[PDB]
Symmetry: C4
Subunit: 93 residues, 4 copies
């Protein structure tokens, strides 16, 4: 709960940074920048968007290393402290 | 066993939702929608399919965050409670 | 050691199955089929190769679910029982 | 701390090897080779770059198996021994 709120905020800030960076330097629409940031940090990485500038490539290297750990921490916990109980609630007779 | 059955069903429902969504909004054939949903939530993300609409991009953001944890829970357990014993069975003299 | 040998063999068999399947049904050269099988099961998923047939898509769904757990088990252990000691050996004075 | 320094160096060496290999054999600019090496070993795998030669494909198979474990060890620890405390520091009243 308490830890869920922090990983939420931390994830949001990371995604906001990506949205701002890729819309500015890589010229993406904000929605596309957000979508790309999420697809990147979850490692889905479709490649429909990818950085074309050297600035964008270098940022992306750093963004991945800093952001993957945070994002998957949030995912794992969104799963552990928020969805694991809810599914159990729709279990017990 | 019991926990395997629940993660199976949960995964199936998630994949059904993706199949329905991407066949409707993104215009994929159902088999392609299913295939895309699986490739997305396992993070393989080939990019042969990817959402082209803003609706599809937003759903995909949410779908990834909600679904990755469930899918990899199932994978890890399909591995832990179903394939780890079976391989050991074809071991002991 | 003992467990390393089993995860090695298991991984090899999985990769052989993929190599055979994708070279036959998807028409890839064997080296390309092997490379694609590895890129798939490690979730790198560049998308330079991807299944074009419905048979290939369905197999790929199943291949991912069955194979990711095994492959990452091997990777994690190749890391835990084979490279973690070796790096420590080149540490202690 | 001590363990953070080792996983840092190990990661750097792995990324240097990839940078050298893909710039030489696959003809990438060094910055692109580095970027590609990172995108590969974190499994983001956009596919804007991918090996076109058989030498490059075989190396990439081996590079992934050897490098993913190391890279994600570093990521998880960059998260555990360097960012987990820092976020807690900006917490306690
Ligand atoms: C499918 C190619 C996308 C290119 C992104 C810049
Ligand atoms: C390889 C490009 C695929 C585009 C998907 C809409
Ligand atoms: C980059 C497109 C590859 C298509 C694979 C069939
Ligand atoms: C989007 C296609 C990239 C091809 C890399 C060699
Ligand atoms: Cs990917
Ligand atoms: Cs991709
Ligand atoms: Cs793509
Ligand atoms: Cs693609
Ligand atoms: Cs591609
Ligand atoms: Cs691509
Ligand atoms: Na991935």
């Amino acid at each position: 709960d308490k830890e869920f709120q922090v990983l939420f905020v931390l994830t949001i800030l990371t995604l906001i940074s990506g949205t701002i960076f890729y819309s500015t330097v890589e010229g993406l629409r904000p929605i596309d920048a957000l979508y790309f940031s999420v697809v990147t940090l979850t490692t889905v990485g479709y490649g429909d968007f990818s950085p074309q500038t050297d600035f964008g490539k270098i940022f992306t290297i750093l963004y991945i290393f800093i952001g993957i750990g945070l994002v998957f921490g949030f995912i794992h916990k969104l799963a552990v402290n928020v969805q694991l109980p809810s599914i159990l609630s729709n279990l017990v007779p």
